[PDB]
Amino acid sequence: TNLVAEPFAKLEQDFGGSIGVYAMDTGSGATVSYRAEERFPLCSSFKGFLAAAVLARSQQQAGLLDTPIRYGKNALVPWSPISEKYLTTGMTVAELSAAAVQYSDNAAANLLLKELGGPAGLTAFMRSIGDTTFRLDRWELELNSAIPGDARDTSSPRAVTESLQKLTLGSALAAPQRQQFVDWLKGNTTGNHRIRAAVPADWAVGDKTGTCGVYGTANDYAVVWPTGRAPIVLAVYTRAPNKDDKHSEAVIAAAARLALEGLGVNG
Numbered sequence: 001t002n003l004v005a006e007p008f009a010k011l012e013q014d015f016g017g018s019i020g021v022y023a024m025d026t027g028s029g030a031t032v033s034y035r036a037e038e039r040f041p042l043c044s045s046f047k048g049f050l051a052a053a054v055l056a057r058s059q060q061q062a063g064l065l066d067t068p069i070r071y072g073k074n075a076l077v078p079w080s081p082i083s084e085k086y087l088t089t090g091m092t093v094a095e096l097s098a099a100a101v102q103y104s105d106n107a108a109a110n111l112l113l114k115e116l117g118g119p120a121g122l123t124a125f126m127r128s129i130g131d132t133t134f135r136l137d138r139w140e141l142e143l144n145s146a147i148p149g150d151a152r153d154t155s156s157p158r159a160v161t162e163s164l165q166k167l168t169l170g171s172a173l174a175a176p177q178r179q180q181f182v183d184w185l186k187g188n189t190t191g192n193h194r195i196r197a198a199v200p201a202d203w204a205v206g207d208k209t210g211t212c213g214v215y216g217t218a219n220d221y222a223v224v225w226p227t228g229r230a231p232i233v234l235a236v237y238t239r240a241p242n243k244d245d246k247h248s249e250a251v252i253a254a255a256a257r258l259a260l261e262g263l264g265v266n267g
């Protein structure tokens, strides 16, 4: 862990807040860790784990992913860019899952949360894979409040990375479902200025972002496949003390670069 120190403190000071980073080289097991056991708000980043929980359930329900879900206008939530285009038709569970992952679609996320038994149901799924840190407590949009000191709707960078590894590379999902989760993450559209900006174009990568809109709070987690070596799993979370502090995508990209440098991954 931190065999090579990196200037995360200067980065977060220039940002005006706190940055939390965990990065794991799945080959050697080496890690980079900075504020990695502090809690940070998940914001929309819970939607990746939501999609994984849906995939886990689909292992016992063979028709789940292709089930058509019809919803009313009252299910739309601000920032539902995919589900608003299918209000009059409905969408399948798999489509809602992909929209939640790849566009952070809020109506899709709340519909899938209901399917799983709400925030406690998603939390139970995370417990079932050995994550004792993650907690979801509220729905969209209330879960974005990012109040300083509030543990609701938070996890730690370390637990996020550990759970992401289990789900994308480990045995927490069966192999077809594992690859589907990876493929949804690879198709994300919201993360081009975050971890992806630190990842060379010739490497494969999937990610899920989160942006709370207050308290300088935003994040990204990713699996990255550098060519010729084992994949890297990493999480970068930010927060800041004042409600009107702005988040920064550049700070997240910069922290990801430092993490890769700390791991000796040439990028």
Ligand SMILES: *[B]([O])([O])C1=[C][C]=[C][C]=C1[C]([O])[C]C([O])=O
Binding pocket: 043, 044, 045, 078, 079, 103, 104, 106, 140, 141, 144, 190, 209, 210, 211, 212
């Ligand atoms: B999510 O972070 O709770 C959310 C809520 C409303 C609008 C947008 C989002 C984000 O997912 C956007 C993002 O991922 O950057």
Ligand code: NA
Binding pocket: 018, 035, 038
């Ligand atoms: Na802090």
